[PDB]
């Protein structure tokens, strides 16, 4: 399994305790980091994934997980962690852009409030299957499957902040962070054996008055397994439902105060996922992973 | 009064019968243009503004009005008309872009479905007050009031088609057609002595399930005059309402089958304009001009 389903590894809870597996420095313990803000005293109760360990975390909503190295005359107290297993489904990686010809050869925009979703959405409208974000404000679309052409980069090189949301990475100069344009669409058809479906506008907070239906139709499936590796909802009014495709009967309903079980199975090959959002509130959103069985 | 409230002078009904007032050629009569498609036989009943005259018209939904010149070995049967009075409120003109520094110095996009409204909307989101369209696909934002810096051009130089809608002009290479970003917004506050308010997404067809309120609040006005120099609605379900700001009482309601009077007055300084749109249909839209009185 991948270990983060957020854009910035907010949700990373794994056990990496080096800034990098290769060439890295080791993390300080969050229960000894009292010279800094971020430690188990400020965050008892396990807030932020912090606790009696030295694992990489991101409790300051930065653009990626990190930890405190301990300064070596460098002047550098902390570093971002480069965690290859922490890469949200739909994030295709960080690649080098050497200019002409660029990696994605569709159509572009630049934006003072650019975010990942904003880039994805522009690209999606345009009928392109990939979106690419650079230098915090630039956005590129394209159907090129050879975006990887000029070589992959370490994800820490794609850490320039999104101009629109300082909690999201938007690539780096010469560096472009690539996303599948399906991520966060309001509805869809799905047929794959398994895939992930995120809230509308993920990783941005889901817009107001959203109403989305996603059909998951897997002919030949005897039953389908659902799990929620992410689930943030603020309001009881905001809802996620599962509907029998044939009957439209409501199999399950999950809201701010109803919390999705570990997993559940549905005895159907045809299910609809339904999401209704309150105007008044928006929250982090969710991610649901479905696995079909033959 | 300005003589067109559309982007392409579809609605021009004035009496210009030269391709241009200065240096131009004269128009053929639409009731003699039988060697061409466009004539009073194909269009009896005055369709398209065509009839027993030689006035500039645009019945083929091209990007601007035109007429048939009559060929002079040129090989050229028709030309666009350059009509200075036919310039929809909000269209700020056609200007020269000489590259660095460009006329609008905000932020830009390029788009395979670019239209005027699309450009306006991008710019509007970004908090810029002007949008500029070039070469049919390019879109530029900015707050520069000196966009006119490199000189104005004849509107016929901004006639490259919008990639997204072949009925709209999207500038020309080296040429940029400028719009106020208020045009077609879904709602607003208005205070001016008078101004024009267009359908949502004008000049594109109004999106589905639109619900818009515009407040027109002119303190000191004894009463306010309303007229509709444009009104296309396909469905009875699609509606425009006027509401007493103080009471929210419905002063007037206009829909596909209810047709706005010449003018009407309201004995108030505070009125709300309300627009509800059916999912099923979208139409050309409307333009309403209000004049406050002291
Ligand atoms: C913090 O917890 C770590 C890991 O369990 C432990 O090794 C260390 O001694 C603890 N230090 C304090 C001050 O609790
Ligand atoms: C990383 O994880 C655990 C403690 O949480 C421990 O076994 C291991 O020694 C840690 N690595 C380092 C370098 O401290
Ligand atoms: C067409 O109408 C014009 C303008 O009224 C007139 O001058 C002309 O003789 C008419 N021609 C025909 C064929 O009706
Ligand atoms: C333009 O308009 C009217 C006829 O519709 C006429 O008075 C005038 O002569 C026309 N001009 C030309 C050049 O035909
Ligand atoms: Cl710090
Ligand atoms: Cl504290
Ligand atoms: Cl490099
Ligand atoms: Cl956009
Ligand atoms: Cl449905
Ligand atoms: Cl023709
Ligand atoms: Cl015919
Ligand atoms: Cl020039
Ligand atoms: Cl209201």
From Swiss-Prot, chains A, B:
The chain holds residues 29 to 322 of 473 of the full protein. This is Kremen protein 1. One of its GO terms (cellular component) is neuronal cell body. Keywords: Cell membrane, Disease variant, Disulfide bond, Ectodermal dysplasia, Glycoprotein, Kringle, Membrane, Signal, Transmembrane, Transmembrane helix, Wnt signaling pathway. It is a single-pass type I membrane protein. One of its GO terms (biological process) is negative regulation of canonical Wnt signaling pathway. One of its GO terms (molecular function) is transmembrane signaling receptor activity. Disulfide bonds join 4-86, 27-67, 56-81, 94-158, 119-139, 123-141, 162-170, 186-212. Glycans are attached at residues 17, 31, 189, 265. Receptor for Dickkopf proteins. Cooperates with DKK1/2 to inhibit Wnt/beta-catenin signaling by promoting the endocytosis of Wnt receptors LRP5 and LRP6. In the absence of DKK1, potentiates Wnt-beta-catenin signaling by maintaining LRP5 or LRP6 at the cell membrane. Can trigger apoptosis in a Wnt-independent manner and this apoptotic activity is inhibited upon binding of the ligand DKK1. Plays a role in limb development; attenuates Wnt signaling in the developing limb to allow normal limb patterning and can also negatively regulate bone formation. Residues 88-182 form the WSC domain.
């Amino acid at each position: 399994g991948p270990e983060c389903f957020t854009a910035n590894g907010a949700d990373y809870r794994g056990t990496q305790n080096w800034t990098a597996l290769q060439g890295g420095k080791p993390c300080l313990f969050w229960n000894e980091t009292f010279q800094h803000p971020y430690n188990t005293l400020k965050y008892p109760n396990g807030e932020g994934g912090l606790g009696e360990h030295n694992y990489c975390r991101n409790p300051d909503g930065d653009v990626s997980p990190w930890c405190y190295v301990a300064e070596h005359e460098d002047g550098v107290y902390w570093k971002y962690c480069e965690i290859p297993a922490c890469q949200m489904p739909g994030n295709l990686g960080c690649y080098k852009d050497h200019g002409n010809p660029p990696p994605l050869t569709g159509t572009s925009k630049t934006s003072n409030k650019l975010t990942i979703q904003t880039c994805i959405s522009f690209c999606r409208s345009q009928r392109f299957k990939f979106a690419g974000m650079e230098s915090g404000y630039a956005c590129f679309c394209g159907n090129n499957p050879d975006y990887w052409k000029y070589g992959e980069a370490a994800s820490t090189e794609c850490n320039s902040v999104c101009f629109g949301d300082h909690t999201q990475p938007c690539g780096g100069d010469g560096r472009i962070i690539l996303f599948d344009t399906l991520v966060g669409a309001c509805g869809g058809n799905y047929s794959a054996m398994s895939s992930v479906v995120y809230s509308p506008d993920f990783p941005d907070t889901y817009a107001t008055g959203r109403v989305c239906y996603w059909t998951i139709r897997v002919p030949g499936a005897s039953h389908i397994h659902f799990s929620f590796p992410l689930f943030d909802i603020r309001d009881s009014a905001d809802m996620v439902e599962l509907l029998d495709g044939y009957t439209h009967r409501v199999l399950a309903r999950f809201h701010g105060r109803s919390r999705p079980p570990l997993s559940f199975n549905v005895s159907l090959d045809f299910v609809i996922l339904y999401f209704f959002s309150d105007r008044i509130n928006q929250a982090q959103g969710f991610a649901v992973l479905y696995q079909a069985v033959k």
